[PDB]
């Protein structure tokens, strides 16, 4: 009574079978990649097959992202009685031998051309995944990447299939799944997904009717309540203070902060980033931007006038973010904006980089202000202007040199730079292709690397816009919502000379809710 | 139902005396109050949902005060001043404390169960002196549970092994006594004019027990396998406490002795086999022990009082040596004092050193063999006491860098010989309370869990996070317990980490 798999040995066969499905799921290993596991070094004592490492239960902890490679290797040098330097060696040689499967990468490229939904489902650890993302170039063929170290789940547990089906909204009826390991294929079949076993010299194809029901939700009821509680919390805050409040102090957690609430920038940030604000709040906060007394001829000052220090200039950051939002909500025309954009091009320093302030007496640069200025440039038609070349290069170097790990002049948190960069790169992809992979690669390395809710939320948002599901940061984010539904205050940006952080519970809650939304 | 209002101290004493276990809260029953910009009423802080987060030990006072500062639209500093005055104006309830003293004196089982935040609890533990009457203290911010959720009552019942039939609960909040009654515990509502006694039929039979059992079995199988293959406990060395890049060393007997002394549920075959390693050890010389095996002994490296102390203490405790054979070595240790009278680390007058934790382990053997009151110990004992009170231990000891290791080994001494160490008990417990969850290393979490339990305090925060760092083979990560300080070499194993983690799981089961 065991279901007899149809064998396949002709590309014509493989092709007709694959065409019968809307959605194809690849696993990386074997199907799309291969490598040499055995690797002898100048260390005679110990194991010789990296397979001993990958078969060890500690490896499950690495794949799920619970531990890193240094940790895994330290525990394995003990369990496997092999000098850890030899295992590190072995693991490196195996990684260096990785190559694509040329046949299946071509299948993958074609499937993507025929406008199919394609997902990558792989047990692979964060550090390896980051390296694979850099080394190969089929990732562009995937509609979504589901990696164990980003999920805290792993094949063959049904949990990972259940999260895949739910996350990607998959109709398992029209879904097939290509993998080498049988137990992964059996698990997916009990979910009603048809399987395609990749063998040495053939494919085993089991069509699966399925159509049975799904089990209990990993945390869905939890999530719906926390989202509602956060929404109620934030809508109440913003309806009472549509001019988004801020607090100041000398630390990122704003411990002991005092209420300031006289800068309009936070309001602009919230208008731009949380895409589910009720309409009355958008309008009420939009009203604030326009009537902001620090508007002078379509240029904005950070401060309200009453709070404006002596001789504090308009800045290209407030102005850029505001104009961009106005433009995008049909409250300003490109014709009115372009003259302001032109003042910005006239604000470059000796190195050609557009500067922060509308004031030649206050020369400053900042990578994120650069980014937000370029965003407005491309949004209005200026994307090919020659005067932007040096500014774009400043931002690219900031990324590639990993200089962003030290923060920007006004934004200390590295993920804030990656986040705003990801809006530019994703929203204007033709003009930013060379950024896409180094950006996605930095983000992969940073999954779950900090505890601050807003930072976790930024990484969730950016990686998802770039096609990668970051469930780990998601989970931890839920754990830090407080009982009233809001998240804790966060110092998004600083007055550098005085080391004054600025932030609000509203800022943290808005990005958190957006991150919960984007993975929903 | 309807309570039976009580106002006779003679009746009350016959109600209470009918019960084997009495649970007190803190508010009103034992502690009460008796006498510009925003919120003048602290009522608003405590009724606010954020306050529940503070009570569960999910956030600390600073976090809570910044969040409330915003939600109550009051300057942070004002909220903090108010919070400090309220706490500072707390006074003992003299009648009820005396009831408590007497219930304790009559050998009842008494537990404290309070919704109080970690920092406040920490203050109250130091301020007031009725804690010595409880058999266990169950504070929400350390349980990550809170009244009146049934969870906490289930935790208390199973944690303390309470027969709810013979258990009565004294609280001033109605809803707490209600939930308590759902578990068959008789309630006694405290009003300032009377008591409301409601008897309840108990005796009829928490919520991670399936998971916890699996992790414990997995960890046991792991450690059992390691020690059966390597009864001479292995060790790795490196520059760092996580022994990243460590190399197999495994030529020192101390780790074996530590395992034996510290993890109580080892199987008999493993205890026997590890005991053989301690007895057949190379470095043994006339019932003094050397850290190293001979094959690894550096030139002129002396026997040391720490390995010797732990080993003799273990053999004694396992009837392999008599006090008569040990006492002459103890006398040698008394002959090892430096100019300040402190007992030194090495059997070698040319390697003069002191180490508060080595002192502790020496003092332990001293009290175990009957030397507890020898005058020559006074300075050593004062060394250790100051080392704690001055907070010098936060800098580590010479050979153990982690502060909690000192607190943990001190807690063996203080709790095993309580009459001789009463003045250590409060400052020790107090320090430990302020260090709950202050570090991530599993072994350090394990030590704080054991020490606090031995001192009558359930630390479940560190417990839960400990369960999360077990690896999938059942063992916990390696950890560097002690160092050669001059080369800054750390020693450690997964056996050490896994042994302590399992004892922590056991002591809270
Ligand atoms: C060379 C090297 C890095 C060795 C260590 C392991 C590793 C990450 C190999 C590269 C390819 C890969 C993703 C294998 C497992 O993933 P899968 O879960 O996609 O494969 P499966 O279905 O074959 O288990
Ligand atoms: C996020 C953002 C709006 C960035 C652009 C600049 C800006 C207006 C920042 C807001 C906060 C602030 C007053 C900074 C100036 O601090 P300083 O006076 O210590 O530094 P400066 O001499 O660099 O102005
Ligand atoms: C100033 C301030 C409010 C500080 C926070 C801690 C606090 C509530 C102190 C007052 C008395 C006390 C220790 C109550 C504990 O709650 P219980 O669980 O002992 O009391 P209940 O049964 O009445 O809740
Ligand atoms: C935990 C314990 C057993 C403590 C007592 C002393 C002892 C034998 C420690 C074991 C580790 C060791 C070899 C230290 C050598 O210290 P060094 O040679 O680096 O410095 P020294 O001059 O302090 O010996
Ligand atoms: Cl790609
Ligand atoms: Cl600058
Ligand atoms: Cl910068
Ligand atoms: Cl574009
Ligand atoms: Cl006390
Ligand atoms: Cl010394
Ligand atoms: Cl010391
Ligand atoms: Cl005693």
């Amino acid at each position: 009574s065991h279901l007899t798999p149809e064998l396949i040995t002709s590309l014509q066969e493989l092709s007709q079978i694959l065409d019968r499905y809307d959605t194809i799921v690849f696993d990386l290993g074997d199907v799309l990649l291969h490598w040499d596991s055995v690797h002898f070094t100048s260390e005679t004592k110990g194991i010789d097959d990296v397979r001993k490492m990958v078969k060890h239960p500690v490896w499950q902890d690495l794949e799920k992202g619970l531990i890193n490679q240094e940790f895994a290797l330290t525990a394995l040098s003990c369990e496997l009685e092999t000098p850890c330097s030899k295992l590190k060696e072995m693991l490196e040689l195996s990684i260096a031998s990785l190559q694509v499967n040329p046949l299946m990468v071509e299948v993958l490229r074609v499937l993507h051309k025929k406008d199919k939904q394609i997902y990558c489902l792989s047990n692979v650890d964060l550090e390896s995944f980051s390296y694979l993302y850099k080394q190969f170039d089929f990732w562009k063929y995937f509609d979504g990447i589901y990696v164990s170290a980003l999920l805290q789940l792993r094949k063959p547990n049904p949990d990972i299939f259940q999260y895949l089906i739910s996350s990607a909204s998959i109709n398992t009826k029209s879904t097939i799944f290509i993998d080498d390991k049988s137990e992964n294929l059996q698990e997916a079949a009990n979910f009603g997904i048809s399987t395609l076993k990749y063998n040495k010299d053939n494919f085993e194809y089991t069509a699966i009717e399925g159509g049975w029901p799904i089990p209990l939700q990993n945390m869905t009821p939890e999530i719906h309540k926390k989202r509602t509680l956060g929404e109620d919390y934030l809508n109440l805050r913003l309806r009472k203070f549509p001019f988004c409040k801020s607090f100041v102090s000398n630390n990122v957690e704003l411990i002991g902060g005092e209420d300031f609430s006289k800068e309009i920038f936070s309001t602009a940030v919230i208008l731009h980033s949380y895409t589910s604000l009720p309409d009355d709040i958008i309008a009420s906060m939009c009203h604030e931007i326009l009537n902001h007394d620090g508007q002078n001829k379509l240029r904005w000052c950070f401060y309200k006038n009453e709070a404006r220090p002596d001789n504090f200039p308009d800045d290209l950051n407030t102005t850029s973010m505001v104009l961009s939002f106005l433009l995008n909500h049909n409250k300003l025309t490109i014709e009115k904006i372009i003259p302001v954009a032109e003042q910005m091009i006239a604000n470059r320093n000796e190195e050609g980089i557009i500067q922060v302030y509308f004031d030649d007496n206050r020369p400053r640069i900042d990578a994120i202000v650069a980014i937000n200025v370029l965003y407005l440039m491309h949004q209005i038609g200026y994307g090919e202007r020659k005067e932007l070349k040096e500014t774009e290069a400043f931002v690219f170097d900031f990324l590639i040199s990993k200089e962003y790990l030290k923060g920007t002049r006004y934004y200390p948190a590295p993920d804030v730079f990656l986040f705003f960069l990801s809006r530019l790169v994703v929203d204007f992809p033709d003009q930013f292709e060379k950024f896409h992979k180094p950006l996605t690669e930095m983000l992969i390395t940073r999954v779950n690397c900090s505890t601050f809710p807003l930072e976790r939320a930024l990484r969730i948002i950016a990686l998802k816009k770039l096609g990668i599901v970051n469930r780990v940061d998601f989970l931890k984010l839920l754990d830090t919502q407080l009982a009233d539904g809001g998240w804790p205050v966060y110092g998004l940006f600083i007055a550098p000379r005085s080391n004054t952080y600025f932030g609000s519970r509203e800022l943290s809650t808005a990005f958190a809710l957006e991150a919960l939304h984007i993975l929903s």
Side-chain angles (χ1 to χ4, degrees), chain A:
Chain A
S1 268
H2 300 288
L3 203 30
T4 291
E6 154 163 30
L7 293 201
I8 301 162
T9 43
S10 77
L11 291 192
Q12 195 78 48
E13 202 66 27
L14 192 60
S15 189
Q16 70 189 35
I17 287 162
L18 292 179
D19 211 317
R20 308 185 200 170
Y21 301 87
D22 300 18
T23 300
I24 293 100
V25 183
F26 290 74
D27 95 296
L28 281 181
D30 275 7
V31 178
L32 292 174
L33 301 169
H34 55 74
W35 70 98
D36 291 355
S37 56
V38 183
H39 270 306
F40 288 71
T41 62
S42 43
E43 291 266 24
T44 72
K45 295 301 184 173
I47 62 144
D48 298 311
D49 200 356
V50 157
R51 271 187 279 254
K52 312 280 185 197
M53 308 183 60
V54 178
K55 287 176 183 173
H56 196 286
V58 171
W59 199 261
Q60 325 189 351
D61 295 308
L62 177 56
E63 308 181 321
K64 298 212 288 192
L66 303 175
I67 66 184
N68 67 21
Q69 283 194 17
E70 243 186 4
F71 247 66
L73 290 167
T74 286
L76 293 170
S77 68
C78 166
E79 296 319 301
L80 299 176
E81 321 202 35
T82 301
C84 70
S85 75
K86 176 184 178 178
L87 300 175
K88 183 165 177 181
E89 195 146 61
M90 301 179 50
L91 182 77
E92 299 177 323
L93 296 183
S94 300
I95 286 180
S97 72
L98 279 172
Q99 303 181 103
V100 299
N101 175 311
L103 160 73
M104 292 315 301
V105 171
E106 250 301 299
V107 172
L108 167 72
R109 185 193 59 90
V110 169
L111 286 164
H112 168 69
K113 291 197 73 160
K114 292 144 98 191
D115 283 356
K116 260 143 169 60
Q117 281 294 291
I118 320 181
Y119 299 107
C120 175
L121 179 71
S122 172
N123 285 2
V124 58
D125 66 278
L126 196 68
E127 288 154 297
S128 300
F129 176 47
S130 183
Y131 170 88
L132 298 172
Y133 197 83
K134 200 201 188 96
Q135 261 299 117
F136 304 94
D137 307 279
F138 48 76
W139 310 105
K140 62 181 184 279
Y141 301 138
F142 291 123
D143 294 307
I145 299 164
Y146 290 77
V147 156
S148 57
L150 270 87
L151 298 177
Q152 232 166 65
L153 308 159
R154 56 184 294 287
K155 293 169 304 164
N157 299 341
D159 278 356
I160 200 168
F161 296 91
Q162 181 184 355
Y163 181 86
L164 174 58
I165 299 178
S166 165
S167 181
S169 300
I170 289 171
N171 172 348
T172 70
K173 186 78 178 168
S174 70
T175 292
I176 189 157
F177 170 52
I178 310 158
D179 194 302
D180 65 288
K181 320 300 228 301
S182 260
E183 45 183 324
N184 293 345
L185 300 163
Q186 170 71 300
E187 199 50 60
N190 296 341
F191 281 85
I193 290 176
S194 317
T195 61
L196 196 52
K197 190 179 184 183
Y198 179 75
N199 277 319
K200 196 182 182 74
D201 306 297
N202 82 100
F203 292 100
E204 314 190 37
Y205 163 56
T206 306
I208 285 308
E209 273 192 12
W212 33 66
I214 301 174
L216 64 78
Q217 308 313 120
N218 288 335
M219 293 163 316
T220 302
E222 168 175 354
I223 302 172
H224 176 82
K225 288 177 189 171
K226 306 224 194 177
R227 297 185 55 190
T228 302
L229 182 70
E231 307 188 334
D232 298 339
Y233 172 86
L234 176 69
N235 295 343
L236 193 145
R237 290 300 300 192
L238 297 173
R239 268 153 183 162
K240 183 167 200 280
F241 311 95
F243 191 110
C244 180
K245 303 193 76 75
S246 64
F247 300 67
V248 290
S249 70
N250 62 335
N251 61 100
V252 76
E253 294 102 349
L254 287 146
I255 290 185
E258 286 166 72
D259 172 307
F260 174 71
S261 297
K262 292 170 188 69
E263 52 80 34
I264 193 162
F265 188 69
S266 293
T267 301
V269 167
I270 293 211
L271 282 170
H272 254 318
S273 306
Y274 180 31
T275 80
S276 293
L277 272 203
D279 290 339
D280 74 272
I281 296 172
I282 293 163
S284 153
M285 303 179 77
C286 182
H287 179 267
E288 297 304 310
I289 304 286
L290 296 168
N291 292 96
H292 171 64
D293 53 353
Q295 195 242 106
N296 162 65
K297 303 188 193 177
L298 286 192
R299 301 185 336 183
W300 270 257
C301 176
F302 177 75
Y303 289 104
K304 287 176 152 177
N305 280 332
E306 81 188 75
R308 195 189 138 256
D310 282 340
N311 292 316
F312 200 83
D314 305 318
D315 80 89
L316 284 65
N317 204 11
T318 312
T319 299
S320 269
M321 284 230 200
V322 165
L323 290 177
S324 173
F325 165 85
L326 294 174
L327 173 55
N328 191 86
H329 291 248
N330 309 275
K331 313 257 191 187
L332 270 182
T333 65
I334 293 174
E335 187 170 81
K336 314 286 171 190
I337 290 165
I338 263 166
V340 181
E342 201 53 41
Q343 299 169 46
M344 281 166 24
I345 287 179
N347 198 36
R348 279 175 294 149
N349 71 12
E350 284 73 40
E351 295 70 65
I353 310 180
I354 299 170
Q355 287 168 118
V356 170
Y357 287 112
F358 278 118
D359 174 11
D360 295 322
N361 296 316
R362 207 177 178 122
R364 304 291 198 272
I365 67 179
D366 173 291
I368 286 161
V369 181
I371 292 174
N372 290 326
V373 163
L374 293 174
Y375 191 100
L376 180 68
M377 292 303 175
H378 285 252
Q379 190 184 356
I380 69 179
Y382 270 32
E384 305 280 15
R385 285 283 301 274
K386 297 181 182 59
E387 305 86 334
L388 305 177
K389 165 171 193 175
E390 309 84 272
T391 295
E392 192 189 294
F394 166 57
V395 172
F396 190 68
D397 294 354
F398 209 78
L399 176 68
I400 286 312
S401 75
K402 296 184 189 169
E403 187 156 11
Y404 79 96
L405 295 171
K406 312 179 164 190
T408 76
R409 173 164 181 83
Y410 305 102
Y411 302 82
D415 293 310
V416 182
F417 168 83
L418 304 177
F419 173 78
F420 289 100
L421 188 54
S422 77
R423 321 194 109 154
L424 182 68
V425 170
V426 166
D427 281 8
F428 301 107
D430 302 324
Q431 291 287 305
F432 285 96
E433 312 189 25
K434 63 163 174 168
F435 289 70
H436 187 276
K437 293 201 84 199
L439 173 66
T440 305
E441 189 224 336
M442 309 299 192
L443 279 170
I444 296 172
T445 67
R446 293 184 60 80
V447 168
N448 185 39
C449 85
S450 75
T451 51
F452 298 94
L454 181 145
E455 297 175 16
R456 322 193 97 112
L458 295 196
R459 297 188 300 254
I460 292 148
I461 292 162
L463 280 166
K464 173 67 197 212
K465 285 167 179 172
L466 294 163
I468 293 157
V469 177
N470 175 3
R471 169 172 190 265
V472 166
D473 274 318
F474 178 93
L475 305 178
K476 323 270 197 193
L477 182 65
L478 292 175
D479 296 346
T480 56
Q481 194 192 26
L482 312 168
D484 59 1
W487 276 257
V489 63
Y490 180 88
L492 185 49
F493 50 89
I494 59 167
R497 284 175 312 105
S498 67
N499 212 68
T500 307
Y501 286 71
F502 297 69
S504 59
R505 300 191 68 196
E506 285 91 342
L507 286 173
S508 292
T509 311
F511 282 114
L513 288 167
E514 183 66 23
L516 293 191
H517 173 56
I518 206 164
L519 287 210
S520 54

